[PDB]
Write a protein that holds these residues in place. Structure first.
Motif, PDB file in Angstrom:
ATOM      1  N   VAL B  20       5.506  47.137  58.704  1.00 58.43           N
ATOM      2  CA  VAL B  20       6.033  47.381  57.382  1.00 58.43           C
ATOM      3  C   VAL B  20       4.912  47.262  56.355  1.00 58.43           C
ATOM      4  O   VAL B  20       4.252  46.216  56.361  1.00 58.43           O
ATOM      5  CB  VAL B  20       7.140  46.345  57.053  1.00 58.43           C
ATOM      6  CG1 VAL B  20       7.604  46.443  55.606  1.00 58.43           C
ATOM      7  CG2 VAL B  20       8.258  46.535  58.066  1.00 58.43           C
ATOM      8  N   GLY B  22       3.073  46.041  53.450  1.00 56.86           N
ATOM      9  CA  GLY B  22       3.340  44.924  52.590  1.00 56.86           C
ATOM     10  C   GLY B  22       4.245  43.845  53.112  1.00 56.86           C
ATOM     11  O   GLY B  22       4.621  42.955  52.345  1.00 56.86           O
ATOM     12  N   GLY B  23       4.730  43.925  54.346  1.00 60.45           N
ATOM     13  CA  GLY B  23       5.668  42.964  54.858  1.00 60.45           C
ATOM     14  C   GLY B  23       5.354  42.586  56.295  1.00 60.45           C
ATOM     15  O   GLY B  23       4.428  43.079  56.908  1.00 60.45           O
TER      16      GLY B  23
HETATM   17 NA    NA Z   1       2.373  44.862  57.360  1.00 59.90          NA
END
Ligand code: NA
Lengths: 66, 66
Positions: B20, B22-23
């Protein structure tokens, strides 16, 4: 897994609930249904499944038609 | 619902991870994969999915190849 019986399932809407002895009914969406058959269920059908927490609360995962 | 990309997927074992932007990475099991055909993913595959929390922690649900 967890065993239950389908309470109802609407094959146009693609969802229903699974009744479990001594517990709350669990929401089931058609996307959780396993197998190569049509992703539908019918009242009274025996199923095995896992309970997972989604953004609306408990729901069924890995629904296998017995 | 959100989008990501398959980071890796062990076809034999039937599981891997979605990255993901940013995650955190999200575990994906073959039972979550939607559509017709053999349930598998390749590295780099674009997907959409939901996150649910099971007994083992967060995992993907409703994985659609994009
Ligand atoms: Na990531």
């Amino acid at each position: 897994m967890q065993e239950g019986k389908v309470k109802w399932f609407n094959n146009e809407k693609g969802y229903g609930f699974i009744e479990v002895e001594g517990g709350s009914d669990v929401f089931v969406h058609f996307t959780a249904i396993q197998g190569e058959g049509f992703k539908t269920l019918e009242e009274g059908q025996a199923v095995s499944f896992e309970i997972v927490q989604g953004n609306r609360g408990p729901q069924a995962a890995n629904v296998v038609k017995e």
